[PDB]
Assembly symmetry: C3
């Protein structure tokens, strides 16, 4: 046993004539999410230059050495104990993966990508050709390797150690650990104390698959199922069924009935992250196939030496059974030449210590995979903001939070924009606490205009296209315009021909009258209708054409009540009474 | 001990002269959610034809047999070992219950309903008259029976076994297991080694109840309490208080004070699914009543034989105590005539193995009853959709998700319908990225018109009912119409009478002039008001009635500036000077 | 040993010549969230009057006594056993804190405030000057003290016990338990069996801190980090880095590389309730300083007597080491004068029982601090109601739930109010399933108007301010009014002067005609423009001023087709040929 100091430099060599204990253990875990266990324990007499050492290594052959790092020492009386684990499981826990996210790549490329964060110290050897994906964010490298291991790969670690330090390190990726060995164990000559165990707790013949939810929120707990999938060639499955059954397994492990017939065994299997149907069926089929036969375990003391993970054959001639199994646990005592092994399926996972470890890991996982009050509030806020329109399209309910991040989220106005989003649109229709208004080019709030007011006072200037029909007009003042200074007015049941004037008041629209057709309250009754004239103005009933207009009656500018100067022009044929002197007399 | 093969056919009988161990254990669990434990263990010498057996049974009396299913087997030193459990706890785990949901029914009917999923194999015997409800979805029958058992029933299982297989199976429902036996145990003659234990850990005299939330979201953690419920006859409880206290229990187990008085003990009890007040009070009262006395347990070796669940009486004359207890655990050894029993309240739930089992079950329950990111997102989406209007009432915000299910959830228009929902309404008011518009009968076809445009151009054709008053009209063109071809036009500050015409342009409304009362720019000043005429048209100031109007002045069709033929008609009284051959005249 | 009854009255004294066992244990837990352990165990021969006692006490010196409360009692064979804990840890579990919520106060004031719920039985002694805050709701006092202890204080409990009961109780608050003692332990003379353990499992040199989320909802898992904080004087930390590193620790405990250089060790530390950067950096620095050196533990059997928590010194001359450690566990045996102690850092937390207890506590905490279906639904409802406007501002989508609390949540109308909320505003713009309408002062009523209708029918009476221009008017009836009974009408392609009238129909607006400027269908062609008169009415073309208008032609009330009476007034100047019994005449 060679001991190294903190810089991995050789210090001392301990022989086999001084050590009091030397034990090495290896074990392949039942689950695929755990690494391979490797522990060494050595204890010798107390020394003063062995309390600074941090590494210890043993010998496999002339070219391969295994390195163990001390985790704990215990001086008792004068005997120093020690305890070590593999170097890789302790070194690869101090590299941080910021964020890595492959999508549908092979395992070899994923390992290449992960081992980039170790700064070229670690390499990799071997390959697998299965495609998978994962999301690695802030986490250690060992956890990432654990996650990769679940896809069907098994990992090891090695060194190239000399007396002056470590030179090269690499990681081997394989499918199954161990080649096939030419070993032969016989009970009574090579295997000494054989204990055979058989278990039948978990046996199924039919399973019902379930998926990742259908309509969550109703509370009815629906899940995706393979109800309407046809699948014939591997195992005949009908179209109206919802479970996979193997016939012969039912005949061999079924529940007998009254009539001598057999019935199947059905248990429910849940997959939390399956969204398709065919892959759910494949997963359920694999789960059914894995759990169809009882488990067998052999545990014994052996003479011949085998590595971990080989295939060996064990025989027993007195009771006449013959099996082929796979070594999965080895406890090698170097000092006393005693070797203990185990073959077959692993049933060591039901001991108390493993259960304690699994419970602690489960608590630690649940603490990080579930959502507390803050996360629920944040998710609700995000999903409400998505539908309110605060991130996308043309309809939006504004709140001060959308502008300052600091005030309340309470809405005070509703905005309909032109295109896209707030910065991508040019026109706005705003509904706020002042009335339905409009906003110009930019939403820096040029100035808010008003079309409707909340008390209900429409603004008339917004009528700019169309034809008006089918209504009544009353009380209003009408007017027209020309290039000169003449306009027609209808104010208070009056027709006014006057001169133009520009103003901003209802009363000030009226100008200087010249001719006003009207009516007069004639003698306490409204039976007088006539026009009027005004002096210094010309009036007429001019006749002719569009270019020429000659006076039928000419009204002078000086026409007055006193100066009744009733000019007339034009050849007029006057049928009716005529006047020269006194008394009416007829004509032509 | 009789051994059966995989089809429940008798194979071999083993005597008592060749067995090495036979042990049978029974135990009633402390909690009501666990079944009754039944375990048998037997070991004999190795045999070839015993490695295929799957059932082993023992004898109770001449008509009752108990059947055990082998779960494990272990050849160690040609000494085979077997371990078995009850058949019922293993067979009823392979029957899937899908979607069974009773509401407010009796336990007997619930068990009858559950046992219809076993295909007539299992029956039921007995009954309990208590009302309860449960929700069973995809799950096995055993878990359903476990859930039912929590409502105040206790279950057993039985068979009717013969040499050629099982004939009938049934499940018995009871209130308490065991009748009242006539047995008497005396210490020193019938009971050998007696160990008595007394516990005082959980002792209370007052409790404060809490309910299923009040206003969750504030984060203040309010809960429903019985603050304002009066309850007098069982135990006097005032109105202003929020806890139940029994006086004598306080006097007997109260904290002494400085003045020699006693104080109560208060602890908080939480019920997660209580929504009313009186039932919360009843539950708190029952919890208080249950936990008011210290616990006692007896464990001893017994000569006499009793079944499980009976009521036996134990006496001790030297120390002078006499108690009446209930048997709850029996460990019967058939081969050596040794019986071990326990009496009183169960305190076996604090051992390490039970704690490990409870921790595993608790973790597995938490993994299923708490929600991750996906469930929170789905619930938020559902609750946002409810309030957006996408499922119900008359105000709704459209998004592409509501029509095509594949695009984003971002809104782009707001729709107000007529009645009900999208398919139950005929008329629509729509405000989208092109202005306030309207939609006809069917919404599936856009057919979108516009009333307001986002730049603010109202369409005038939408004014169809009302009276218009209190505004000004300027610049606009006015027109009327009749059945014939006459209309009145006010264009450019002139009154124009023409012939009617139909057109679609502002300029084309004007027609063929006949008489245009207008004004003339008379000598660089606007003081000329006059009419005009046009040849080949008739003009007049006709006078008379509504039927008839005769010309005061008749304007001929040929009236012209050149041909000044101004025909006049009617009896006229022309007072004033006149024009006859250069003289002034008078009234004859 | 003195035994008390249920009222804490002395009953019996047991000497040292009758007891069979007496053992006292004390231990300081590794975590700061657990109290100080104190356990006593005594056993003696069975006595009749010792089965009612509930307290047993021992002697420290002539003035200090320790009180223990019996929890379990076990009569076995003829020897009674007992098991007691400290009085305080059992008494202070029966006082209920309703709600206390201090903010940024000192520990002394927090303890003072908490100890007001014991009704002046418990006092306080000592003090610590550090500022902290906590939120206490319904919970017992012991959990509150546990939570306070996490801020850097350590608690003890005491009594003033006499033969007639307890007189005064108090709690001492300290920062560290134990003074500095003048003790000297030498191996081989005063310490007998020394076992030393050194642990190196968790050693780090650099850490990466994380905070309380950044944008939860995207699913990317961002967290607050100290990326852009400069912090130099304690440890030089640059501006572009995301971790804190100590140099010399890396030089002493670093991973050696190929070229002889050393590398750092990084692990991720998560704080779930940190929102600022400088405090996150401080917490990470404190963790790094706490986890930088390996741990050492001494366990031995000593001769001299020391209290719990002192600082002693242990020496060993043969192996030449000298350490200064702190006592943390004492197991004093009173009957046999044997004392067993432990020194240094506590490594007793990895035993099986402690792990079981921690797992149970973790499950119980997770069950209470996570959210199930009901909580998620309630939070989503609250956060949707906040943004819908149902609590605050001036835009609101009202649903029947907002008024009756019992019906569904689907919205049926949208309301825009004036100010604040429903009760603080006067004018409303309501958009519902009937049309865009308005509501007067109070909203509790249903005085709903209708401007728009869903079929697109505007109401013309809502135009009340503005100027109308740029449109066309067609078909509509135009009218005016005056104080008298005259109005100008333009209906059916004609101009009508008539008498004013009031009505509510389109047809009834027309009145009694007087003068109707119109057109006549003159001989199958529309070339006739004419006016008419009506008998018993006066007509004229009056001329003059605004005050005076004299008839150019006077039309009498009796003017008729038969009674042609065309009165003319005013001195005329008439050029033309005239009618003097035929031919043609001259023109003055």
């Amino acid at each position: 046993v060679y001991f190294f100091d903190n810089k991995q430099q050789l210090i001392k060599i301990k022989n086999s004539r001084t050590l009091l204990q030397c034990l090495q253990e290896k074990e392949i875990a039942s689950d695929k999410s755990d690494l391979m266990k490797d522990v060494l324990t050595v204890s010798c007499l107390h020394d003063v230059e062995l309390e600074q050492c941090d590494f210890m290594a043993v010998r496999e052959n002339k070219g391969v050495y295994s390195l163990y790092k001390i985790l704990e020492e215990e001086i008792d009386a004068e005997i120093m104990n020690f305890k070590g684990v593999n170097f890789g499981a302790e070194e690869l826990n101090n590299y941080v993966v910021s964020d890595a996210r492959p999508v549908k790549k092979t395992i070899t490329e994923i390992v290449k990508q992960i081992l980039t964060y170790t700064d070229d110290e670690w390499l990799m050897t071997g390959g697998v050709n299965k495609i998978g994906s994962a999301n690695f964010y802030y986490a250690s490298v060992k956890e990432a390797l654990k996650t990769v291991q679940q896809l069907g790969c098994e990992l090891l670690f090695f060194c190239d150690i000399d007396g002056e330090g470590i030179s090269s390190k690499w990681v081997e990726v394989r499918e199954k650990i161990g080649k096939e060995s030419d070993d032969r164990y016989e009970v009574g000559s090579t295997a000494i104390k054989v204990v055979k165990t058989k278990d039948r707790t978990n046996i199924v013949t039919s399973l019902v698959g379930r998926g990742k939810g259908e309509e969550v929120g109703d509370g009815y707990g629906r899940r995706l199922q393979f109800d309407s999938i046809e699948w014939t060639q591997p195992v005949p499955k009908p179209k109206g069924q919802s479970f996979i059954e193997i016939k012969e397994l039912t005949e061999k492990y079924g529940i007998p009935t009254k009539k001598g017939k057999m019935r199947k065994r059905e248990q429910v299997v849940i997959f939390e992250d399956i969204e398709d149907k065919n892959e759910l069926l494949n997963a359920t089929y694999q789960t059914l196939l894995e759990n169809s036969r009882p488990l067998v375990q052999f545990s014994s003391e052996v003479i011949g030496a085998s590595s971990i993970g080989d295939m060996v054959t064990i025989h027993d001639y007195d009771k006449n059974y013959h099996y082929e199994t796979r070594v999965f646990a080895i406890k090698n005592d170097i000092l006393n030449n005693k070797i203990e092994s185990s073959l077959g399926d692993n049933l060591k996972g039901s001991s108390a210590s493993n259960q304690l470890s699994k419970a602690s890991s489960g608590i630690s996982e649940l603490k990080s995979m579930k959502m507390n009050f803050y996360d629920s509030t944040e998710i609700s806020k995000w999903q409400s903001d998505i539908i309110r329109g605060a991130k996308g399209g043309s309809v939006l309910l504004m709140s001060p939070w959308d502008t300052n991040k600091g005030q309340s989220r309470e809405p005070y106005q509703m905005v309909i924009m032109n295109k896209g989003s707030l910065k991508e649109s040019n026109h706005f229709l705003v509904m706020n606490s002042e009335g339905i208004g409009f906003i110009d080019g930019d939403f820096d709030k040029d100035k808010f205009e008003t079309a409707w007011t909340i008390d209900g006072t429409f603004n008339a200037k917004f009528i700019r296209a169309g034809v008006l029909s089918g209504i009544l007009i009353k009380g209003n003042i009408i007017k027209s315009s020309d290039e000169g200074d003449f306009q027609i007015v209808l104010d208070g049941g009056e027709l006014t021909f006057e001169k133009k004037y520009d103003s901003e008041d209802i009363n000030d629209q009226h100008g200087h009258p010249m001719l006003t057709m009207k009516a007069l309250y004639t003698d306490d009754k409204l039976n007088g209708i006539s026009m009027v004239q005004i002096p210094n103005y010309s009036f007429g009933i001019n006749s002719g054409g569009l270019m020429v207009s000659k006076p039928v009656i000419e009204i002078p500018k000086e026409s007055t009540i006193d100066s009744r100067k009733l000019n007339l022009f034009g050849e007029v044929r006057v049928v009716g009474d005529f006047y020269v002197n006194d008394v009416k007399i007829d004509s032509n």
